[PDB]
Design an enzyme around this catalytic site. Structure first.
Site, PDB file in Angstrom:
ATOM      1  N   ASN A  35       0.846  -1.185   0.000  1.00  0.00           N
ATOM      2  CA  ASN A  35       0.000   0.000   0.000  1.00  0.00           C
ATOM      3  C   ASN A  35       0.887   1.242   0.000  1.00  0.00           C
ATOM      4  O   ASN A  35       1.944   1.260   0.632  1.00  0.00           O
ATOM      5  CB  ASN A  35      -0.947   0.009   1.203  1.00  0.00           C
ATOM      6  CG  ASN A  35      -2.082   1.027   1.046  1.00  0.00           C
ATOM      7  OD1 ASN A  35      -2.620   1.203  -0.045  1.00  0.00           O
ATOM      8  ND2 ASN A  35      -2.446   1.699   2.140  1.00  0.00           N
ATOM      9  N   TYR A  69      -8.203  13.109  -1.105  1.00  0.00           N
ATOM     10  CA  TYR A  69      -7.923  12.263   0.045  1.00  0.00           C
ATOM     11  C   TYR A  69      -7.438  13.154   1.172  1.00  0.00           C
ATOM     12  O   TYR A  69      -6.707  14.120   0.933  1.00  0.00           O
ATOM     13  CB  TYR A  69      -6.863  11.213  -0.307  1.00  0.00           C
ATOM     14  CG  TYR A  69      -6.403  10.342   0.842  1.00  0.00           C
ATOM     15  CD1 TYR A  69      -7.173   9.265   1.267  1.00  0.00           C
ATOM     16  CD2 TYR A  69      -5.195  10.587   1.493  1.00  0.00           C
ATOM     17  CE1 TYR A  69      -6.767   8.464   2.297  1.00  0.00           C
ATOM     18  CE2 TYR A  69      -4.784   9.793   2.539  1.00  0.00           C
ATOM     19  CZ  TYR A  69      -5.573   8.722   2.941  1.00  0.00           C
ATOM     20  OH  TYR A  69      -5.182   7.906   3.992  1.00  0.00           O
ATOM     21  N   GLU A  78     -11.174   9.042   7.639  1.00  0.00           N
ATOM     22  CA  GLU A  78     -10.436   9.038   6.387  1.00  0.00           C
ATOM     23  C   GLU A  78     -11.437   9.200   5.249  1.00  0.00           C
ATOM     24  O   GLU A  78     -12.424   8.459   5.193  1.00  0.00           O
ATOM     25  CB  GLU A  78      -9.673   7.719   6.255  1.00  0.00           C
ATOM     26  CG  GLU A  78      -8.819   7.613   5.020  1.00  0.00           C
ATOM     27  CD  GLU A  78      -8.191   6.265   4.915  1.00  0.00           C
ATOM     28  OE1 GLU A  78      -8.891   5.275   5.213  1.00  0.00           O
ATOM     29  OE2 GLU A  78      -7.000   6.196   4.565  1.00  0.00           O
ATOM     30  N   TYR A  80     -12.439  10.074   0.943  1.00  0.00           N
ATOM     31  CA  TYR A  80     -12.052   9.821  -0.433  1.00  0.00           C
ATOM     32  C   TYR A  80     -13.061  10.443  -1.381  1.00  0.00           C
ATOM     33  O   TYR A  80     -14.267  10.291  -1.186  1.00  0.00           O
ATOM     34  CB  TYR A  80     -12.028   8.325  -0.747  1.00  0.00           C
ATOM     35  CG  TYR A  80     -10.852   7.540  -0.240  1.00  0.00           C
ATOM     36  CD1 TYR A  80     -10.836   7.042   1.062  1.00  0.00           C
ATOM     37  CD2 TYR A  80      -9.791   7.229  -1.079  1.00  0.00           C
ATOM     38  CE1 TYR A  80      -9.777   6.295   1.533  1.00  0.00           C
ATOM     39  CE2 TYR A  80      -8.727   6.475  -0.622  1.00  0.00           C
ATOM     40  CZ  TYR A  80      -8.723   6.011   0.688  1.00  0.00           C
ATOM     41  OH  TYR A  80      -7.673   5.263   1.161  1.00  0.00           O
ATOM     42  N   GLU A 171      -3.030   6.302  -4.982  1.00  0.00           N
ATOM     43  CA  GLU A 171      -2.909   5.211  -4.023  1.00  0.00           C
ATOM     44  C   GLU A 171      -2.844   3.896  -4.772  1.00  0.00           C
ATOM     45  O   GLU A 171      -3.641   3.669  -5.693  1.00  0.00           O
ATOM     46  CB  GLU A 171      -4.071   5.173  -3.027  1.00  0.00           C
ATOM     47  CG  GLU A 171      -3.873   4.082  -1.979  1.00  0.00           C
ATOM     48  CD  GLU A 171      -4.986   3.987  -0.947  1.00  0.00           C
ATOM     49  OE1 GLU A 171      -5.898   4.844  -0.948  1.00  0.00           O
ATOM     50  OE2 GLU A 171      -4.948   3.045  -0.124  1.00  0.00           O
TER      51      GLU A 171
END
Length: 184
Positions: A35, A69, A78, A80, A171
């Site tokens: 990641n 993000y 978090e 997105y 990402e």
């Protein structure tokens, strides 16, 4: 509202070569990553910020996302806004849709259990806006973030009151690829 912030995070698996180029530009090459989150933006996010970006390239080989993000605290969320993805379109629990900047997005919540976060190992929540079809690459693209923040509230999803960074992020997850993006 020119960028002031650069983010280069990886999980140690694979090879991720990111470049912090001039201005709001960045490039990133990756082979067999675990990641990673690389991108350019602002160290403190705003719910009314209008974000522009041009991706000269977005060529994931497998799973990768191009998205707005960033994080809030109180509560720890978090978030997105996905405009492009590779072989896997991200989904969670469906909450409805939002139409903004020409396109429609589905809205998803999700929970992450005992995961890396800006505050260490935590269990926290994910707010997602995800385009229903992939947006064009090479075009100057706008994300009016206020629309997503208002659609989210209009769907039960309030963001926290302390704002951490806010970036136009590439990402990757168990993939290879290349990306070159200018952010302003």
């Amino acid at each position: 509202d020119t960028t002031n912030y650069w983010q280069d995070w990886t999980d140690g698996v694979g090879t991720v070569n990111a470049s912090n180029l001039a201005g709001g530009q960045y490039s990133v090459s990756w082979t067999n990553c675990g990641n990673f989150v690389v991108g350019k933006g602002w160290s403190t996010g705003s719910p009314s910020r209008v974000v522009n970006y041009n991706a000269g390239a977005f060529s994931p080989n497998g799973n990768g996302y191009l998205s707005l993000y960033g994080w809030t605290r109180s509560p720890l969320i978090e978030y997105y806004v996905v405009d492009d993805w590779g072989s896997y379109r991200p989904t969670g629990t469906y909450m409805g849709t939002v139409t903004s900047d020409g396109g429609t997005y589905d809205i998803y919540t999700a929970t992450r259990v005992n995961a890396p976060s800006i505050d260490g190992t935590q269990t926290f929540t994910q707010f997602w806006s995800v385009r229903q079809s992939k947006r064009s690459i090479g075009t100057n693209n706008t994300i009016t973030f206020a629309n997503h923040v208002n659609a989210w509230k209009s769907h039960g999803m309030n963001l926290g009151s302390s704002w951490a960074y806010q970036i136009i992020a590439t990402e990757g997850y168990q993939s290879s690829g290349y990306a070159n993006v200018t952010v302003w």
